[PDB]
C-alpha cells in the first residue's frame, strides 16, 4: 500500500479562509501564524459578501486541464487500480456546500460534479451529476471516469475527513486578509505533514487584500 490514492487520483483541496473575530476575549497584544486564516463560512454561506478575484481563481484552477498530460495519468491509474469530447476535472463537494451554490451556476460548468450525501437520491437529479454515500465510494467512481484532476471544494466536514483519511495531495489556499464572523472553520494544517511551497502576488479585490498560497504534502512519513 505504498501506492497512494491521492497521488494516483491526484486529489486536491481548494479553499479560501478569512480571519476570525477574536470573540472579544483575547489577551493584551496579538500574535499571528498560518492558523490566523481559518474562517470558512457562516450559517451556510461564505463569511464575506463577494470577492470576485477569488471566484475567478477558483474557477480557473478547478476547470483547467492539460490534455497532453492526461495519457500519462491514464497510464498511471489503470495500472494501479468519444464519450466526453472534452477532458474534465472532478469537483467533490458536500451537500451543504452544494446547496449554498446559487442556481445559475450549478452544476459548475466544464466540471464533473459529485456530491457527498447520505440522504440525497440520484434520480430527481441529472444522470450527469453523480452522488456518493461515502468517501470510499468516490475512489471507485474515479476509477471508472476519465478525468484530469479531482478537487475537493469543501465544506468543513468534507475537508476534515478528506484530510484525516489523508486523501489530499495539495491545498490551494486563498488567504483573505480581513475579518468576518464565522461558525465553520478549516482544520489546523499540521506543519509536519503539509508545507507551503508557493506564494503569489498580493491583490486587492472588493475592499480587501488577499494572496494565494499552495501547501504540498510532505514526504516524511
Amino acid at each position: 500500500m505504498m501506492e497512494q490514492v491521492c497521488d494516483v487520483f491526484d486529489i486536491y483541496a481548494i479553499c479560501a479562509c478569512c480571519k476570525v473575530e477574536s470573540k472579544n476575549e483575547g489577551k493584551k497584544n496579538e500574535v499571528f501564524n498560518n492558523y490566523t486564516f481559518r474562517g470558512l463560512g457562516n450559517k451556510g454561506v461564505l463569511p464575506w459578501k463577494c470577492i470576485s478575484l477569488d471566484m475567478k481563481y477558483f474557477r480557473a484552477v478547478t476547470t483547467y486541464v492539460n490534455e497532453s498530460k492526461y495519457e500519462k495519468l491514464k497510464y498511471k491509474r489503470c495500472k494501479y487500480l468519444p464519450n466526453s469530447k472534452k477532458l474534465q476535472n472532478v469537483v467533490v463537494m458536500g451537500r451543504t456546500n452544494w446547496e449554498s451554490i446559487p442556481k445559475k451556476f450549478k452544476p459548475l460548468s466544464n466540471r464533473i460534479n459529485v456530491i457527498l450525501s447520505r440522504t440525497l437520491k440520484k434520480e430527481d437529479f441529472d444522470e450527469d451529476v453523480y452522488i456518493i454515500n461515502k468517501v470510499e465510494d468516490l475512489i471507485v467512481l474515479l476509477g471508472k471516469l476519465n478525468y484530469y484532476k479531482c478537487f475537493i471544494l469543501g465544506g468543513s466536514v468534507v475537508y476534515q475527513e478528506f484530510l484525516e483519511k489523508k486523501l489530499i495531495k495539495k491545498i490551494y489556499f486563498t488567504r483573505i486578509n480581513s475579518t468576518y464572523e464565522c461558525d465553520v472553520f478549516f482544520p489546523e494544517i499540521n506543519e509536519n505533514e503539509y508545507q507551503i511551497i508557493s506564494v503569489s502576488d498580493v491583490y486587492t479585490s472588493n475592499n480587501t487584500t488577499l494572496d494565494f498560497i499552495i501547501y504540498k504534502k510532505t514526504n516524511n512519513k
Partner: protein, 326 residues
C-alpha cells in the same frame, strides 16, 4: 523542440563554479527560503536583494567600522493600488516615521520637536558629541541644520539656527511639485531634491533619500525615490513605508490615485552584525500585506495630522532585533 534546450546550456559555459564557497554561508542557512518554488509575493523583492548581497556581496569596511556586505544598484517596485508594502516578515511600527514625515513637510530642523513626541529617529544625530564630530561646534544640541525639511521648503536660503523665521526664503520645492502635478502633469521636471551640495557640511548628516521624482498618467501618480545609501536590515523597511505613505499623501491632495512607488538603491548594504537576524527573517514566509487609509477630508499637504492615518489588517511575524548585541 528541445533543440534550443542544449543551446541554453552552451550560453552558460562561462558561468562561475559556485562549488566554490563564498561569504561563509551554510546551505541550510536558507533552507526554507530556497524550498519555495514560486515566490511572487512583493516582499520577496526586498528579501531577494538581501539574499543576493549575502550570497554575492562584497566585504567592505564603512564609515561606522562594523563592516558590511554590499552591492551597487537595485530597483524595487510596489503596486500601491493593490496593497501597502509594510514588511510582514518582522514587526514594524509607523507612528514615528509618520511624525518624521509631517515634520519634514513643516520644513522643520528642530530635533526637539520629535523628541517631545517620543520619536527618537534623529536623537543620536543631534547630540553634542555627534555635532562636534561633524565639526559643528557652534551648533545647539538637536539643531540638525539644513536637512530634508529645510531643503523641501527653503532650498537655497541661508541657514542660521533652528528657531529662525524662514517664511518665503529659498525655493519651496514641495509647493512647486504639487502645482506641477496639478497643472502640468506631463512635465518631466517634477522632482523634489534634498541633496543641496552647498549645505551638506552644515547638515548633522548628508541625506540618504536624495530625490523623489513623480509621474502622472490616467489620473494616477507614481513616484521614484533614489537612495544613495541603504541599510537593508534596518533602514530600508522604514524607507519603503515612508515614501509609500508620502506618495499616497501627494496623490490625495492632487485628486489622483496612487499607482507605483519605485525604490532605486545605490550603495545597498547588509551590516555584518545583522547577518544572523537576516538569516532568520529570510526563512519566514510573507503574509498578505495590509492597506493604508487616509482621512479623505485632508485636501492640502500641510493639513495632515497623525490621526489622519490608519493601517488596516496588518498581519506579521514577531519582531526581530537586527543587532547581534541586541
Amino acid at each position: 523542440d528541445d533543440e534550443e534546450e542544449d543551446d541554453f546550456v552552451y550560453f552558460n559555459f562561462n558561468k562561475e563554479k559556485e562549488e566554490k564557497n563564498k561569504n561563509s554561508i551554510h546551505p541550510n542557512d536558507f533552507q526554507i527560503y530556497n524550498s519555495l518554488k514560486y515566490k511572487y509575493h512583493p516582499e520577496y523583492q526586498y528579501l531577494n536583494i538581501i539574499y543576493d548581497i549575502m550570497m554575492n556581496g562584497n566585504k567592505q569596511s564603512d564609515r561606522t567600522g562594523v563592516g558590511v556586505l554590499s552591492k551597487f544598484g537595485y530597483i524595487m517596485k510596489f503596486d500601491l493600488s493593490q496593497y501597502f508594502p509594510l514588511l510582514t516578515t518582522k514587526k514594524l511600527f509607523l507612528r514615528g516615521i509618520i511624525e518624521e514625515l509631517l515634520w519634514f513637510i513643516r520644513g522643520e530642523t528642530n530635533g526637539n520637536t520629535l523628541l517631545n513626541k517620543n520619536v527618537r529617529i534623529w536623537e543620536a544625530n543631534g547630540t553634542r558629541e555627534f555635532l562636534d564630530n561633524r565639526k559643528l561646534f557652534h551648533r545647539e544640541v538637536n539643531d540638525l541644520g539644513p536637512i530634508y525639511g529645510f531643503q523641501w521648503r527653503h532650498f537655497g536660503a541661508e541657514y542660521t539656527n533652528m528657531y529662525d523665521n524662514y517664511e518665503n526664503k529659498g525655493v519651496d520645492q514641495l509647493k512647486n511639485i504639487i502645482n506641477l502635478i496639478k497643472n502640468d502633469p506631463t512635465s518631466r521636471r517634477i522632482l523634489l531634491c534634498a541633496w543641496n551640495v552647498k549645505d551638506l557640511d552644515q547638515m548633522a548628516l548628508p541625506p540618504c533619500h536624495i530625490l523623489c521624482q513623480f509621474y502622472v498618467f490616467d489620473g494616477k501618480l507614481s513616484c521614484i525615490m533614489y537612495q544613495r545609501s541603504c541599510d537593508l536590515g534596518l533602514g530600508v523597511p522604514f524607507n519603503i513605508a515612508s515614501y509609500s505613505i508620502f506618495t499616497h499623501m501627494i496623490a490625495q491632495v492632487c485628486n489622483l490615485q496612487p499607482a507605483q512607488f519605485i525604490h532605486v538603491l545605490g550603495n545597498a548594504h547588509v551590516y555584518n552584525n545583522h547577518i544572523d537576524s537576516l538569516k532568520i527573517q529570510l526563512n519566514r514566509i510573507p503574509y498578505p500585506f495590509p492597506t493604508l487609509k487616509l482621512n479623505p477630508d485632508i485636501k492640502n499637504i500641510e493639513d495632515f495630522t497623525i490621526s489622519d492615518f490608519t493601517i488596516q489588517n496588518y498581519v506579521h511575524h514577531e519582531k526581530i532585533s537586527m543587532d547581534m548585541a541586541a
